[PDB]
């Protein structure tokens, strides 16, 4: 039934190889936050030569299955990975921090095996407004996963972009009300904050 959903971008990938090879292509891997990014600010991707490959609802396991077709075969200079939100959501099954982290490491190793540079990013803050303990538990699980990612990134000299620290508001780490409406997906103002951070990091890598 095409569990990884390679069908979603199969035709779009064909149209890209037909348009030729591009200089300094950046592919964005992620879920609805990344898919909605292109839908909400098409100019940011069009004007900069960025290619969005987000699919809503997907986990880091889906991203690993799509990595070769949706990243490697597009011969990009750089890949931006944002993964973990739906792993934690458990819409596809029980969360396992070690499995999620391992999927990210597998994607990094596939990218480096193909001379594709990597930028790792933080799982975004997430609203769990049932009560205060629910929000704290959600925030603690996100920080715990991001801690694994940042330690791996530092150890392997991979840039890490910390969306979380700039978008999570006190006291319990809820996604800032200025940056969201549903507490999960950024608004355009929220995306503008992420764009400044990731563009600075991309430009440093691409030189």
């Amino acid at each position, epitope marked *: 039934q095409d569990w990884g959903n390679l069908k979603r971008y199969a035709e779009a990938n064909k149209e890209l190889v037909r348009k030729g090879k591009q200089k300094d292509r950046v592919v964005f891997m992620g879920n609805s936050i990344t898919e909605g990014w292109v839908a909400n600010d098409a100019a940011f991707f069009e004007d900069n030569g960025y290619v969005g490959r987000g699919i809503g609802g997907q986990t880091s396991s889906h991203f690993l299955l799509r990595f070769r077709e949706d990243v490697i075969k597009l011969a990009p200079a750089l890949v931006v990975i944002n993964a973990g939100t739906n792993d934690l959501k458990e819409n596809w099954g029980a969360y396992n*921090e070690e499995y999620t982290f391992g999927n990210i490491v597998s994607m990094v190793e596939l990218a480096r095996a193909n001379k594709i540079k990597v930028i790792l990013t933080s799982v975004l803050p997430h609203r769990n407004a049932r009560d205060e303990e629910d929000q704290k538990e959600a925030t*603690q699980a996100i*920080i*715990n996963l991001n801690t694994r990612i*940042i330690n791996y990134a530092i150890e392997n000299k991979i840039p890490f972009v910390d969306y979380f*620290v700039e978008m*999570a508001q006190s*006291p319990n780490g809820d996604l800032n009300s200025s940056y969201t409406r549903d507490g999960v997906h950024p608004t355009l103002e929220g995306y503008k904050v992420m764009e400044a951070l990731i563009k600075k990091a991309i430009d440093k890598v691409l030189s």
Partner: antibody
Amino acid sequence: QVQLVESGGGVVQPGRSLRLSCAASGFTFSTYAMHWVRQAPGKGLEWVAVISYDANYKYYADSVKGRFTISRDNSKNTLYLQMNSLRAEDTAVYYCAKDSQLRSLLYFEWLSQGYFDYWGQGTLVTVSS
Amino acid sequence: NSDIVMTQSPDSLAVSLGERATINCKSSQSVTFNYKNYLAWYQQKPGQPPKLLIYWASTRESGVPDRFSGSGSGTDFTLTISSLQAEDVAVYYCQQHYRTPPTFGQGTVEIKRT
């Protein structure tokens, strides 16, 4: 092996100040949060303060807030506790303690810490005239 | 007010040498998160600093003898000494580090005799 050596303790007049130091060795000090914990005579252990690996975040026990300042020098592998306006109830053996977690992200004051995997020998602070 | 409270009930226990010592610790709220128990045990002899005995509720630190074991989850935890040795007479601390401030509970093991 991991060593933590505290110094700076002694008898100090109420109201005065005192600076404790904790010299660390045997581990990459700059990548771990560090803690101060104290034990008053005949009492249990009371956590005092934590400082993140990069010194960006510091949190304190309510009992010392506004009077104590935790700091670190990662180039010297040394942790400090600056104690101001000392009171008789601050009398205790003060321990520095290493946090078990690598580069913990202490973005908020309530987040999980590690367990305290290594402790110093302690330095006695006696606040008395 | 929101600090997690650690309590040992009873807070003192007299155990005959050679017999089983069981120390119970209770937290005011669950300290288990993502299948991990944020509960540590420490031993302190007089004039000595505390020493880590058990971490993640049930993992012995290197060098700790086999007669020490920890168990429990959620709000109820136990430190067991299968056969009490004279060198095991000490103060014992249970510690949660699930939330800041990390907090400790205290109890003593003493030798029972006639």
